[PDB]
Design a protein around this ligand. Sequence first.
Ligand SMILES: [Zn+2]
Ligand SMILES: [Zn+2]
Lengths: 53, 8
Amino acid sequence: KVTCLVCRKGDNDEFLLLCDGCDRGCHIYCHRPKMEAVPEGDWFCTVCLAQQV
Amino acid sequence: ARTAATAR
Ligand SMILES: [Zn+2]
Ligand SMILES: [Zn+2]
């Protein structure tokens, strides 16, 4: 049931990156700055980045 | 990281 934070759609799930800190997602093609591929390491969405210290 | 396709 994951949708992209930017465009609010869940289509093209092969491009729909999942946050390692929560249930949120983002299409690599909606990401700014440019994200050409799904990263191998952990990715954190902006809501999770806001919880860091 | 992983995608919604690779998860399900
Ligand atoms: Zn999107
Ligand atoms: Zn998150």
